[PDB]
Design an enzyme around this catalytic site. Structure first.
Site, short mmCIF file in Angstrom:
data_model
loop_
_atom_site.label_atom_id
_atom_site.label_comp_id
_atom_site.label_asym_id
_atom_site.label_seq_id
_atom_site.Cartn_x
_atom_site.Cartn_y
_atom_site.Cartn_z
N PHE A 142 0.87 -1.18 0.00
CA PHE A 142 0.00 0.00 0.00
C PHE A 142 0.89 1.22 0.00
O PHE A 142 1.89 1.25 0.73
CB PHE A 142 -0.91 0.01 1.22
CG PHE A 142 -2.08 0.95 1.15
CD1 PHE A 142 -3.21 0.64 0.37
CD2 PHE A 142 -2.12 2.10 1.92
CE1 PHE A 142 -4.34 1.53 0.34
CE2 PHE A 142 -3.23 2.99 1.90
CZ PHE A 142 -4.33 2.70 1.11
N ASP A 196 -3.43 9.39 7.08
CA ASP A 196 -4.72 8.89 7.54
C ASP A 196 -5.80 9.97 7.55
O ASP A 196 -5.57 11.13 7.87
CB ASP A 196 -4.59 8.33 8.96
CG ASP A 196 -3.93 6.98 9.02
OD1 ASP A 196 -3.74 6.36 7.94
OD2 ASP A 196 -3.52 6.54 10.11
N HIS A 248 2.99 7.48 5.76
CA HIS A 248 3.45 6.14 6.00
C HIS A 248 2.99 5.19 4.89
O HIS A 248 2.14 5.53 4.05
CB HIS A 248 3.01 5.69 7.38
CG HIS A 248 1.54 5.81 7.64
ND1 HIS A 248 0.89 7.03 7.79
CD2 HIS A 248 0.59 4.85 7.79
CE1 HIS A 248 -0.39 6.80 8.05
NE2 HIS A 248 -0.60 5.49 8.03
C1 LIG Z 1 -2.03 1.17 6.93
C2 LIG Z 1 -3.47 0.92 7.40
C3 LIG Z 1 -3.47 0.60 8.90
S1 LIG Z 1 -4.52 2.42 7.09
C4 LIG Z 1 -4.63 1.92 5.36
C5 LIG Z 1 -6.01 1.97 4.61
N1 LIG Z 1 -7.06 2.82 5.14
C6 LIG Z 1 -8.21 3.00 4.48
O1 LIG Z 1 -8.40 2.55 3.35
C7 LIG Z 1 -9.27 3.78 5.22
C8 LIG Z 1 -10.50 2.95 5.52
C9 LIG Z 1 -11.67 3.78 6.05
C10 LIG Z 1 -12.99 2.98 6.25
N2 LIG Z 1 -13.44 2.18 5.10
C11 LIG Z 1 -14.06 3.96 6.68
O2 LIG Z 1 -15.07 4.21 6.05
O3 LIG Z 1 -13.75 4.51 7.82
C12 LIG Z 1 -6.09 0.48 4.99
O4 LIG Z 1 -6.95 -0.38 4.95
N3 LIG Z 1 -4.79 0.46 5.41
C13 LIG Z 1 -4.18 -0.20 6.57
C14 LIG Z 1 -3.26 -1.35 6.16
O5 LIG Z 1 -3.09 -1.67 5.01
O6 LIG Z 1 -2.69 -1.94 7.19
FE LIG Z 2 -2.49 4.57 7.45
#
Ligand SMILES: CC1(C)S[C@@H]2[C@H](NC(=O)CCC[C@H](N)C(=O)O)C(=O)N2[C@H]1C(=O)O
Ligand SMILES: [Fe+2]
Length: 328
Positions: free
Chosen positions: A208, A213, A267
């Site tokens: 990713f 955030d 990040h």
């Molecule tokens: C780095 C993160 C902790 S954060 C990043 C990514 N974050 C998102 O897409 C936001 C999700 C918001 C959710 N649907 C809502 O409506 O509130 C994810 O998943 N990722 C995680 C990952 O891949 O570990």
């Molecule tokens: Fe994140």
């Protein structure tokens, strides 16, 4: 690759009434927020072994039929009302990650924001109780457990900034919080689909890409497999894993409110072929919540940034994140 300084902070004084001890926690939250932007919360009181166990049982036992029935509208056109809450499917041979997102359990058909069809408010969807006994009960109780921890952390951040301890927490309420839990599975796959691996400009293989955030703060549990990196001026640094603590960082609403005194750290997630969990709680306020921006660096504290309501911030932020780093 360097390793990031991520201090462990005993947060237990934030639940008590020793005010000097709270100030000493606040000082450490300040120091970490103005360095890499991350810290681990320890002595939090949450049973994270049970969280991990129950989450694994759900991910490993859910079937394709159930996933279609829970899918968000990106994966099922029938589900026009599920933009946030529900199942985010993997695509065999193309997309490895899959996840389940749920919202405030107080969002029911009775709730006035659901009656009004206000954006970002939805009613949670759940699997069948007989196929996943006890899952909904556990997940709703976990929401309130981590809500409690987050409230305490928000008192810590208020004190760090020179405000009374309820400055942020007064806006973080069980009747209207937009906060979400996401239960993310990162699988072991052999062979691993090449389409699911991105290459960074610096050559790093990623799951990713870089982001900030969309949150006030993010309260993250992960299993014990190293994956996260934080950007600094000198390049990305690895964050060490710790499956007993919560990883804490600010989101871009905190950077707005403080005129970037507390930055939202950028990040990214390294590619690792290992079966693991990533379980964030995104601390979001209410749809109409607004805090006046201020600048902690100035005696008057005055800031030229415009106040921004949380619901508008969140609607824009959730769309932008999809357009930037893809449908998750
Ligand atoms: C780095 C993160 C902790 S954060 C990043 C990514 N974050 C998102 O897409 C936001 C999700 C918001 C959710 N649907 C809502 O409506 O509130 C994810 O998943 N990722 C995680 C990952 O891949 O570990
Ligand atoms: Fe994140």
């Amino acid at each position: 690759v360097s390793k990031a300084n991520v201090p462990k902070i005993d947060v237990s004084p934030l639940f008590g009434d020793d005010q000097a001890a709270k100030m000493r926690v606040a000082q450490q939250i300040d120091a970490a927020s103005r360095d890499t932007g991350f810290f681990y919360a320890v002595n939090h009181g949450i049973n994270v072994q049970r969280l991990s166990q129950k989450t694994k049982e759900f991910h490993m036992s859910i079937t394709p039929e159930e996933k279609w029935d829970l899918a968000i509208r990106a994966y099922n056109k029938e589900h026009q009302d599920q933009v946030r809450a529900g199942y985010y499917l993997s695509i065999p041979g193309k997309k490895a990650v899959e996840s389940f997102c749920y919202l405030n359990p107080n969002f029911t058909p009775d709730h006035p924001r659901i009656q009004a069809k206000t954006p970002t408010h939805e009613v949670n969807v759940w699997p069948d109780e007989t196929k996943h006994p006890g899952f909904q009960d556990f997940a709703e109780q976990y929401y309130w457990d981590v809500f409690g921890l987050s409230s305490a952390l928000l008192k810590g951040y208020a004190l760090a900034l020179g405000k009374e301890e309820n400055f942020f927490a007064r806006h973080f309420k069980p009747d209207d919080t937009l906060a979400s839990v996401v239960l993310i599975r990162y699988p072991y796959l052999d062979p691993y689909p090449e389409a699911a691996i991105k290459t960074a400009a610096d050559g790093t293989k990623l799951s990713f890409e870089w982001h900030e955030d969309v949150s006030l703060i993010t309260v993250l549990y992960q299993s014990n497999v190293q994956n996260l990196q934080v950007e600094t001026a000198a390049g990305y640094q690895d964050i060490e894993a710790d499956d007993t603590g919560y990883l804490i960082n600010c989101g871009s609403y905190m950077a707005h409110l403080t005129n970037n005194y507390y930055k939202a750290p950028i990040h990214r997630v390294k590619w690792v072929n290992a079966e693991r969990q990533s379980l964030p709680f995104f601390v979001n306020l209410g749809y109409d919540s607004v805090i006046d921006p201020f600048d902690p660096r100035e005696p008057n504290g005055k800031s030229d940034r415009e106040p921004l309501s949380y619901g508008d911030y969140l609607q824009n932020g959730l769309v932008s994140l999809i357009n930037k780093n893809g449908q998750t």
